[PDB]
Design a binder for this molecule. Sequence first.
Ligand SMILES: [Zn+2]
Ligand SMILES: [Zn+2]
Ligand SMILES: [Zn+2]
Ligand SMILES: [Zn+2]
Lengths: 771, 81, 319
Amino acid sequence: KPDILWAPHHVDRFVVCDSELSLYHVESTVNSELKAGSLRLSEDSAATLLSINSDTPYMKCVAWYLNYDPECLLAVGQANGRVVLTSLGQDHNSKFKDLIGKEFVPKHARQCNTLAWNPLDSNWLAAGLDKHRADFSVLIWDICSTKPLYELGQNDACLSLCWLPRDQKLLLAGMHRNLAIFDLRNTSQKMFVNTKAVQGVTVDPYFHDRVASFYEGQVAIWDLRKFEKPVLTLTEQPKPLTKVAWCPTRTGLLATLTRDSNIIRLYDMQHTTIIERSVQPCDNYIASFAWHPTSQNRMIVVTPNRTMSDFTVFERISLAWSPITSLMWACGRHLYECTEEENDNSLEKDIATKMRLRALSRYGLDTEQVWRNHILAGNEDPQLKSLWYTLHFMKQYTEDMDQKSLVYAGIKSIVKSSLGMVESSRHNWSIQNLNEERILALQLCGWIKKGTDVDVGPFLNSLVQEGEWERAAAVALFNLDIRRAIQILNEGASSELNLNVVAMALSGYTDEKNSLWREMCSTLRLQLNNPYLCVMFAFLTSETGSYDGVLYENKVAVRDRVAFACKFLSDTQLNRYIEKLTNEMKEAGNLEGILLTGLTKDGVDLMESYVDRTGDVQTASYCMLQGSPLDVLKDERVQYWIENYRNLLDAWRFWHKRAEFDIHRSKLDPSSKPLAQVFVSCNFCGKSISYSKVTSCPGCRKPLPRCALCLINMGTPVSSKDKKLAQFNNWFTWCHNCRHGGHAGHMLSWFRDHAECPVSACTCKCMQLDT
Amino acid sequence: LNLNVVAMALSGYTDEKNSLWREMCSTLRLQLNNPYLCVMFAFLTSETGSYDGVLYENKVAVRDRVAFACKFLSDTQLNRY
Amino acid sequence: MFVARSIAADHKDLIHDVSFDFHGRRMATCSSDQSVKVWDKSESGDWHCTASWKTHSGSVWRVTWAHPEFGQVLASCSFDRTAAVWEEIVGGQSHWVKRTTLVDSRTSVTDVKFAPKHMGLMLATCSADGIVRIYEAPDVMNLSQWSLQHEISCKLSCSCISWNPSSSRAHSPMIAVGSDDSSPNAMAKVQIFEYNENTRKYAKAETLMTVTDPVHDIAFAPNLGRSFHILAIATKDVRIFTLKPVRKELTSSGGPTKFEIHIVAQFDNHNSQVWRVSWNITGTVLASSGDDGCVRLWKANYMDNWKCTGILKGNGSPV
Ligand SMILES: [Zn+2]
Ligand SMILES: [Zn+2]
Ligand SMILES: [Zn+2]
Ligand SMILES: [Zn+2]
């Protein structure tokens, strides 16, 4: 049974027992590469072999001497019973070399089962051997510097033995079928109790009255003060147990390892229910393990392939969160706080952090020009830009109409009433002839500016200045001007080469039913990378009326597809296409569909899906307040979102910003009732004094209460670089407990200089109650 | 990836006198890099009989030009060239 | 994308549980010596202890805060079959005072939790005998008086409970209870009770059949206006469930609401018994701690799929 032992007084030296006994030293390797011949015990630890000994074949039991000198001194008992004292340190100054190599031979050849040193006196060695016919099984000898000092357990089997940590003359031993406690004062004086578990007897260092034993896969605990029946029994394991050990650096902690297992089972007996835990140190079975005597909660395990791993046993960890997305946890007796890395790439941050950052930057309060909110978003996201531009266009149309409701109904509602459109049979390559609903839809899409202009030229030039060549060319072609698109492609290829060959390919448009160009373009059209080119060629190659390739392309912005369907597709199928697109947008929760649904119940469902996907309520709350119809604001979900956002603001103590949001919401939504609070009542009439001398009750004309400092009746007139009618210094103030009060300024000064209620015979510390 | 677009463009061959294809391909072919593409488009867009553009292109190997001239040119024109 | 730091706080004994206040400015920690400590954060950002005392005769398991609207209130459950309520009074040195003790349990009180704010000042305790007791304080200005409102038997050793933080007008109060029994038989380990207004009694609504291993921790996620509820279960593997209510027919309103149960994430990266699970404020990041001495942070992605985002170790050394 291979085993590893630490140095009793050295933290860096340990020994591994096998057919060859190997003494190793532990060194750091964090700042140095893998040293030659050094075993990487862990990621940053290296073990350097100190010595090898092969003079002990068939080792049976091993012990390490206690006293400091000499260093690396051990005792090995063999199968024949010979017990030899060996050393592995480089000791050129041995104190008593006579003990070096000293061997004790049993009178009768029997195998020594266990061997141990006396802690109180290092010169005493106790060894339990095999059961002789009529001879003692336990021998206590003196190493000094002829015969064992003591012999006991005749015709018995000493499975295991241990010393009393405090008593220098008390021993515990495991007989063939019983457990015995013996005193050196009198050999006859012994307490023997029959038991079945006799292997691996050990005592908890912190509790000298606690002992452990195990038989097969069952483990029992004993209390020496009342050792008559086992105090407790652990759960029996399938595989037989192999080693049991107390942790010296932690109270009430026991460790167990069984046969052919890669997991060590730990038990917490410090309850007086035993807490059970398991630790996996490596990917292979552990041959043995050893607690570090002094290092805190450190244990080293050994694998049969001569690979050793040393590790610390962590305790149970407790967790807690904070409203600033900082995770604080506790492990043992230390506290650690974890936050997000402050990297430049802010697009991957959590939704809560982004919401906080947007709140700090007045996100959504720019009512002068709505589209700037995407700039205020801080990050780049097409959905937000699309939403804000849509809102800006709708607001612009509302303002124009007011200068000169249906807009917020959405594209679907607007085009639901469209009538009188005739499809084109052939393309003439060369707006106001179209129905009003489609003109309004195009205005919403942003292709055409306000008015009845029948030219998209300003839009094309804006795109050209924007540098989006392909999109501008696609729009121009959709407006049925091939030469304009070719010119735009040439202009784009002039700056920054594929655009030229694309343009020269574009001139091959033919109407032949079996056109070679048509066939090849249809076949290899999708191989391009830019989606706009793909949809352009799809439109060119598509037959009359059947434009499914253009319509059902997901890589193109919804606005362009909507406009293209508006100007070309027939209404009878346009309604169906709009319905299908609206449904597939709603089920996905993409925000670009707001243009379709509008601020209606469909918009509410789309927003709910969006919130479910991402958990953002700030954008939903700000969006739904933009001139929504009264019925929309009456829905439960919208108000729930608003309340959750307000609670979130209260969590971060952004009190002033919450007040600004409340002002904005109250201005936009009349349905909301402001907070309810207390009001003052007249003593005589009993009515409210809220809204003919000022200092008189409006109802009874009787005097009001008087300031406790100025002795003047309080009062305030009731109904921009101007004068102020009612200064803050003249408002009512009172202590909510003592019910005394007066003017704001007077009491402010008085409590700045004093700490008691200003009324005589009042003991309230009014201003200290609130903090 | 350019080759796919080149092949797509190549499909537009037409013998129409005032075709937009022939109008634009001859103008735009001079801005390519590989001389072989330029000579191909020049040959396609050239008027019948006078294939001077391909013949007098010095950025291409002589053997190909010689073979092309042998396959098509008339005897007297071949001798003079 | 998560980095760690060590806070300069000194403790002499092992820490069992730590808990934050609502605003994240106050901390409560229970130690191994039946001691409770309160820490405050200064404006500079440093932490300082402000109080300390010994509470119970047995071990102290859990300590939790109450909502600030009711003042400064702490609730502590102990192994000595008691649950104590403490309130801070200052005259300024803080002077915490015990106000009441609940002793109705016959076994060790395993866990204690506070109800959400919108239901008043209610409290729940699950014991080891399989009993969940719900108390209420009728008067918020007199915390010395409490009345046992409800009592539920689970027939299994309760180990942890969690309220439903939803505050909508359409969701009845919900409480979920786990168990840690290791019986060889395959029996359910998680049950959910939904309050019924028509009967004013809690009734079992849904039981998680797919969960049969012992359960150590269970946590609802904050609602935040979603259309369904998210639950996190800690076992040999971290599991996440989503519960969606079904449309209740207007023909007749009966017993508990029927639910659709779907698992959306099951992680086994700890390779051990996961011990604690918790949610952030928005219910979008999940923190899990197991026996491997590691803390793992999970989050959703663009495809609405759950994947790990952070791994740390108890010592604070990054992985
Ligand atoms: Zn009056
Ligand atoms: Zn007073
Ligand atoms: Zn007062
Ligand atoms: Zn006054």
